[PDB]
Design a protein around this ligand. Structure first.
Ligand SMILES: *C(=N)c1nn(-c2ccc(C(F)(F)F)c(F)c2)c(=O)n(CC(=O)c2ccccn2)c1=O
Ligand SMILES: *C(=N)c1nn(-c2ccc(C(F)(F)F)c(F)c2)c(=O)n(CC(=O)c2ccccn2)c1=O
Lengths: 301, 301
């Protein structure tokens, strides 16, 4: 029994985190084979940050300005390169600890583990979700840039996220490992608008299912509803619209609980309309939208 | 910015988790040097579980009944031993991956990371807290026994917890690594009472401080209070009494926020008495008691 926000085991990623310094700027990098990856705003400086010309700044740069360190070992930069907003520092030594990996760009609503790092030293691991505004609410202090997000699918590490910046709003933005931001964001010290964050309806329903499997079964209504009717209740409460693909993903959880998706959506409606009246579900007085249906099955089975 | 429940990086513990099987019973063990540690109820069977005589069951046991496997390697049990509720299976091969470690019995209110394992394979990591009833609310499916809780203090792994059982109540009980249960609990399939779980007042105050550092500053009252007066409000709401040792631990967080401990305790009182009125703090509509003052500093600085 039990349901907690759970991150993937982080050992395979710890061995990959190096330090990268440039001028008065130290951040984290990711070392896979002979390439270190890190955010390219490591070559910036104060007066550059408003609208840096990264092409020009990179031309002025000498490998010697690239201080790559793994543990107390210092690595040897044998060249540089810019792929979108990511810098690829090629090196002589290949990482002996390089796991089977791949780069994936994830979709709004998917979750990942974050290994928060400082100075190339792992500090802690926690679970995040890519919101529909392509932000992540995170825990990133100063020096945290270059920390990565990942899933462990089989034995394969699927890197999906590299942290770049905290928006003046207090939420976090970053890129995939090919250097393309999630969202409209650019690596410039300018005010940037994140969109409206809609609640991930399919994640909330997966959680209610986790609740039923862990005992909490008070929210159940014995009513019913239809897609169109629930979705009307969804735009009212800034909930992502539900699709039949969503219903289809929830099916295995439906078969285990004996609870049909539409019957659950009907339970959701009343919590949106009436509320929780001080009751709680899986320890929370709020509806949680950061477990995917896959997360819930991973734990609850 | 940001504050999330964060576990320690788990790599140093992953290398230590083996499989242990006995009869139709498979669970996890912890391999440090030439000793594997695991819960002793691995030698039980169905009819034994109501009141097992572990001495007698262990005498009937032959190393051959102890199937220890790390990865696809199968290890060689060269003897057995019972230390309280823990079984020590000595082996020929010492673990090359054994970190600097120590065994610590933690106090109610302290936190630790749990590496949830199945069949000797790490599945995920999350943060727990030892409650005053010496339970932990966890996420332990079947086969999860032998999973360990730990802190990373310096480079040293401090193992504090080994999971043994889920109480008919839905919460979890276990031992330290010398095999002494936390709490009044025994490894018998009998109904066992956990005590009243009092909220960890010093943890709640550490969180409110984390809130102030992350922007949330609405709960602040501009009132004040005294120990004796707040503690009266604490027994009313089943909150652990506050001591001057508690005030002393909160001091560094006091100096960073410019907020005095008693002024914060006064803010707490009004949230206990009036409530949150639908507002929220660090994302929650509930008061969170599973960050220690040390956890909060670790992240918020
Ligand atoms: C992470 N390592 C980190 N990154 N920045 C930073 C600097 C410049 C840009 C640019 F140019 F816009 F792309 C960024 F996106 C991100 C950074 O400033 N800090 C320090 C920081 O967060 C901070 C905030 C307020 C006051 C002091 N420091 C980083 O740690
Ligand atoms: C963990 N590996 C695990 N442990 N038990 C278990 C068995 C016996 C005792 C004893 F004898 F009381 F000490 C225990 F404390 C714990 C266990 O039963 N399961 C399976 C389980 O949790 C379960 C519950 C309900 C229905 C089916 N299975 C374990 O996984």
């Amino acid at each position: 029994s039990g349901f907690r926000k759970m991150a993937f085991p982080s050992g395979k990623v710890e061995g990959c985190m190096v330090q990268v310094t440039c001028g008065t700027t130290t951040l984290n990098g990711l070392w896979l084979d002979d390439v270190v990856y890190c955010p390219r705003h490591v070559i910036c400086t104060s007066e550059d940050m408003l609208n840096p010309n990264y092409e020009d700044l990179l031309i002025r740069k000498s490998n010697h300005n690239f201080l790559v360190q793994a543990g107390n070992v210092q690595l040897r930069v044998i060249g540089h390169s810019m792929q979108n907003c990511v810098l690829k520092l090629k090196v002589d030594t290949a990482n002996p600890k390089t796991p089977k990996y791949k780069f994936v760009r994830i979709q709004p609503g998917q979750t990942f583990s974050v290994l928060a790092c400082y100075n190339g030293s792992p500090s802690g691991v926690y679970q995040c979700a890519m919101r529909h505004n392509f932000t992540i609410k995170g825990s990133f202090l100063n020096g945290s840039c270059g920390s990565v997000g990942f899933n462990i699918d089989y034995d394969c590490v699927s890197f999906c996220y590299m942290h770049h910046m905290e928006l003046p709003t207090g939420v976090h933005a970053g890129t995939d490992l090919e250097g393309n931001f999630y969202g409209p964001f650019v690596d410039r010290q300018t005010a940037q608008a994140a969109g409206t964050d809609t609640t991930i309806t399919v994640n909330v329903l997966a959680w209610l299912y986790a609740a039923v499997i862990n005992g909490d079964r008070w929210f159940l209504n014995r009513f019913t509803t239809t897609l169109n009717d629930f979705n009307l209740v969804a735009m009212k409460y800034n909930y992502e619209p539900l699709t039949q693909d969503h219903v289809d993903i929830l099916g295995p959880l439906s078969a285990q609980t004996g609870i049909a998706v539409l019957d659950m959506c009907a339970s959701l409606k009343e919590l949106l309309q009436n509320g929780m009246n001080g009751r709680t579900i899986l320890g929370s007085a709020l509806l949680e939208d950061e477990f995917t249906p896959f997360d819930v099955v991973r734990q609850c089975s």
